[PDB]
Amino acid sequence: GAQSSEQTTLPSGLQIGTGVRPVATERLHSQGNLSQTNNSKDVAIKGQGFFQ
Amino acid sequence: MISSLWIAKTGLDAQQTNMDVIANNLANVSTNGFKRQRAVFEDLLYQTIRQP
Amino acid sequence: MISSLWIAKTGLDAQQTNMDVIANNLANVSTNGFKRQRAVFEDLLYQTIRQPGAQSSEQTTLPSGLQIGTGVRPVATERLHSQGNLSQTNNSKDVAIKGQGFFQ
Amino acid sequence: MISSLWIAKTGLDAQQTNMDVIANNLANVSTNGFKRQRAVFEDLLYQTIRQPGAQSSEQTTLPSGLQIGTGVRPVATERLHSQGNLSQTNNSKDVAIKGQGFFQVMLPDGTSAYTRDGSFQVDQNGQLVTAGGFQVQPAITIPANALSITIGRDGVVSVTQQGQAAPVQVGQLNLTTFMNDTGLESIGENLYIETQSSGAPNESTPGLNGAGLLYQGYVETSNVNVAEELVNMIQVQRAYEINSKAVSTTDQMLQKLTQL
Amino acid sequence: VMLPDGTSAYTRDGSFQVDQNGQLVTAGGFQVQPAITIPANALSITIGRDGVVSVTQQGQAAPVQVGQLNLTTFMNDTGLESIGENLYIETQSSGAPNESTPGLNGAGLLYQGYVETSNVNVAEELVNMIQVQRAYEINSKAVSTTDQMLQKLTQL
Amino acid sequence: MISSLWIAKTGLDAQQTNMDVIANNLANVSTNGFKRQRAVFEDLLYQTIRQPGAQSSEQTTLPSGLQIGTGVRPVATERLHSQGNLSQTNNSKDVAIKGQGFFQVMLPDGTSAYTRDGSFQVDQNGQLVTAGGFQVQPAITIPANALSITIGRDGVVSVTQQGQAAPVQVGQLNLTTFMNDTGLESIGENLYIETQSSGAPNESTPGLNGAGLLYQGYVETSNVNVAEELVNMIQVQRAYEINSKAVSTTDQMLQKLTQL
Amino acid sequence: MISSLWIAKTGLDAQQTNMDVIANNLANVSTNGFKRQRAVFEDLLYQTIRQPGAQSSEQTTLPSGLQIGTGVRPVATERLHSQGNLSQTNNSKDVAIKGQGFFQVMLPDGTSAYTRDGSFQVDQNGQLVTAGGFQVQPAITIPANALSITIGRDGVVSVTQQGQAAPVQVGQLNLTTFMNDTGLESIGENLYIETQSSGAPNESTPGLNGAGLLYQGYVETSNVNVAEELVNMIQVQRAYEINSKAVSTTDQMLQKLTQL
Amino acid sequence: VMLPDGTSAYTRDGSFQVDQNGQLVTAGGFQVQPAITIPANALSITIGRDGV
Amino acid sequence: VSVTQQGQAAPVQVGQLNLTTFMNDTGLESIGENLYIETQSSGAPNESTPGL
Amino acid sequence: SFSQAVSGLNAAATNLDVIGNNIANSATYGFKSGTASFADMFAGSKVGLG
Amino acid sequence: SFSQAVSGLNAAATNLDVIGNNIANSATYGFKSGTASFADMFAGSKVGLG
């Protein structure tokens, strides 16, 4: 964008870039398929809650 | 490991429950004052990839 | 990391979704009042390269340019709301539907 | 920096394009009304050096002089607009084309697109829309409590109401035909838009002017034939491998130049 | 094939497409000579053994002849100038382009639904690459030997 | 990319065509008035190399020169026009042909197709129609007050009204015959249309100069033979597998060469 | 640039030609009236260097001196003109040959070609033609109202008309025999033409001095033996392996000389 | 190509860009004559065989 | 040199390619453009039909 | 060539459905049997669709 | 051996069809029973064709 001449501008100048970095590791909080273990004590959640 | 495998395993277990019910019904033909069983099934969870 | 690999990855995912639909249909054979599912797919975006119909010379157009396409995506899962076979259980409480209504 | 390297690079790019087309064809096996793609290749420029036909002697000519060619580039991608095999889905809302016509739908922008896919639904308003929700043209609206929908071979859509012994007509499903079907621009979502190379949209009923016939309860599957795709994958892999070998040979030549 | 500037080129790539006004053209858009215009009411296009193009319209039980595919035969084929995009132009070594019907005057036949592929033999090219590479490595060594001889000579 | 690959890529396609013909024949094993298909193949190009019969010396000729050939192409699938077995399903509206003639039916667009299917119905207006709703020719109307329909061996359709001891003639059914029955173009729905290779439609009465005979209460079944189709599947499968093995051998040969 | 590399290249080309012949033979398995081809090779030139039989010493000669051979080249591909097994297609127009004769057809150019395939049809005018539409000579004209066509063992074509207990003869099918049957030039399309190495076409009746007997309802399938083709494919693959290894070994030797 | 002083030079480097007021310019920013101005709502720019 | 003409089951004889043999081939003068000219040490160019 | 055979399988299933329905109504006053009729789906000749 | 066996299969099928036609016409006045005659199809004398 710098003025290359008195009446013109420089389009898309010289950008030399460095490498790549990892930003973040995100989890996919979705509903997994249910498995029945025939146990009176095992509980499964259907929506978007957590046990405390 | 795969959603299809879990669904098919669940279907297998349900049909095995139906077979067990049928076998128990057949085993008690000569019992007096017996009421035969019938199993009722339902659809499991439905993941909403794209909301209808 | 390369275009063909992404296209094939999308195809694999679509076929896996189809297999899940088939497995769900199989698991609910004994359920009462169940309507089977069917998955519908659509073809994904297109990399344009040469535009189809672009004027090459002053008078001659370019027919059917280089439309390199991407993979596939499933649009929807539709139920088949059709009257299933009625079974006689001879029970005073069991009710069956003959038309296209729903219980509330 | 060396000619053979650029030529083999162009060859590698062409083979990668062929593999891309192959993968796109393979990923769309289950897509309804999909047409397979084919790539067309052409020679690149030709360095002239000696002019073929130049005057070598006063009474002799130079036959077929030294023309040095550049690599290869794809000309264009052409579809195979042919009738795909029909599949019975036993659904009153699915229509299949037997000839060479297209359904006209309206995009949300107001412009019209064309699709050969017949998987239709009915929205909350009753208008016949596609699987993505685009409204067919015209708005084949549907009454409230329909019992059955009958779409004839000539596009007449009728609804059977209760207590009425005669079916009522609620629309007329028409087909659009083009001078050049390969010139339609694919935009995804099984949708083709008009271009200047696809002629003009000729609106017509099913059965006249060439337009195809409509079958209710059937869907037009893709025309992709797998065995051709497998043999072409073998071809693409081996040609890519040969071109990579040529690149490697050029690399060794240049390295030997560097050592001296 | 008729080029935009009006001069005729010649091609053997038989992949054709119908443009927006009918008309058979090459994949690059150049119109093929002579003229075949295919109407809208066409159901199937058949190109015969002798280049006759017939178009079947609905209702008619007899196909309608549209055009003739004329093959241009040269007497010295290799003398043509390759102008790039799968096209050859005539030169002084391939003069007198003879229009003919396919199958007559030595011309070839036409098979519809098939395309002639490249005649490049692959093993020959790989062995030739081996020969070329080793040859460029023996000439480079000759260069190095001459350089060393010169260095030894001019050093004294 | 190599010659044997193209040749074995034509072999695969020809065997796939043979399997398609077999599967289509087996799928329509029960449709009435069906004629099964047979695919025919022919040799492709033959590269001359050394010309056969070339004059090597001034007195010795070269016998059977180096004629390297290309793959195979199918000419066409021809319909095996034979008389299917007649079945007595005892309905007055089913008629079967005994010779080599065809029924003429008027298509909605005004043109005439030709069908050998004899399962006829009566529309709401009383005309004889094909089960697909196409009206037969030269139009045979049936009154509402009809007690019995009698179609004789000569195609005369008679209707007996109530309390009347004499039948009433309501038309005359005629059969169309062609010079070449194979050249007819099948348009589906058990319908064939005339093509220039099928000559011209010669209308004739059933028993004269070559039209067949009509039997009432009979249906003409298909001529497809299941056991022969099974054996042909077993042989086509083996041929396809062997050609695929040729493809694989070519692929392996190209691997070692490139690796070198 | 080095002799062993040229020799191994010639070997590779010969093995590729053998594989091409094998693939062509396997691609035409379903073709009727097809004859399998076999290629024959000859070794290339022999460098003289030391003339054998020369005087090794005043009283002795050199036994079997130093001859250095070049690669290999294919001489010719010979057909195997043998009777393939007959197949019953139960068609009145299919004709098979039991002996050593050929059918004669006329190309559109006016010249005469020869074909052994007997899958015949009838055109729109009534003449007996092949599957490619070429008219079988001598012209056999089938009339409009034919009921059955009978072709006997000696080549007489008879038509039985309606109401006439005697059959009407409408032609005479002859067979052409050549002294050298393998010398014919195959143009594809199951057609062979006469060359100067195939002698002259001798017309003869089918049953006379060596023309074969004509069977109606039979087709002569190809004589390709497939297990032999699989074994030969194994052989060709291994030979190509060994030749490629020779090329690679020569490549490794020249490398050490470059390094020198 | 139009130099800053106003005289016309000539180039064979075919790597062109477009600047912020439309207009085709070279990699250095000099504007190419004749003056070709690509609009903003462009979806795809095609440069034909004959320079159209 | 024989050629095949359409419809002609026989080839048409066009010409004979004669080979020239010298006595001392090593004495020829190599003039450049892959050509040898006769030199007094390689005289007597004898034309012959190849094979004879 | 998979859809072609799938269509034949569906036709055979429909025939067997009709036969089973007819058999189940062997003793049912006022019942009239059913019969399924089939027609091919040729597209442009030389190829079948089922 | 897949063309020599197919011929025998077809011959046996023809014989069985003839036998079935004889059985079906057990009660048909003026009917004459039918029989099938088979002959080999040798070629050279070392190559049988079925």
Residue numbers in the entry:
A (entry chain 3): 53 to 104
B (entry chain ZE): 1 to 52
C (entry chain 9): 1 to 104
D (entry chain 4), F (entry chain ZA), G (entry chain 5): 1 to 260
E (entry chain z): 105 to 260
H (entry chain t): 105 to 156
I (entry chain u): 157 to 208
J (entry chain ZF), K (entry chain ZG): 2 to 51
Could you give the paper's own sentences about this structure?
The bacterial flagellar motor is a huge bidirectional rotary nanomachine that drives rotation of the flagellum for bacterial motility. The cytoplasmic C ring of the flagellar motor functions as the switch complex for the rotational direction switching from counterclockwise to clockwise. The basal body is made up of the LP ring, MS ring, C ring, rod and export apparatus. Here, we present two high-resolution cryo-electron microscopy structures of the C ring-containing flagellar basal body–hook complex from Salmonella Typhimurium, which are in the default counterclockwise state and in a constitutively active CheY mutant-induced clockwise state, respectively.
To obtain the C ring-containing basal body–hook complex in the CW state, we constructed the constitutively active double mutant D13K/Y106W of CheY (hereafter referred to as CheY**), which can mimic CheY-P to tightly bind to the C ring and lock the rotational direction of the motor in the CW state. The C ring-containing basal body–hook complex in the CW state was obtained by incubating the recombinant CheY** protein with the above purified basal body–hook complex in the CCW state. The density maps of the LP ring, MS ring, rod, hook, and export apparatus in the CW state were locally reconstructed to the higher resolutions ranging from 2.8 Å to 3.8 Å. Although the structures of the LP ring, MS ring, rod, hook, and export apparatus in the CW state are highly similar to those of these components in the CCW state, the protomers of the C ring in the CW state notably undergo inclination and compaction, suggesting that the binding of CheY** induces significant conformational changes of the C ring for rotational switching. The hook functions as a joint that connects the motor to the filament, which acts as a propeller to propel bacteria for swimming in liquid medium and swarming on solid surface.
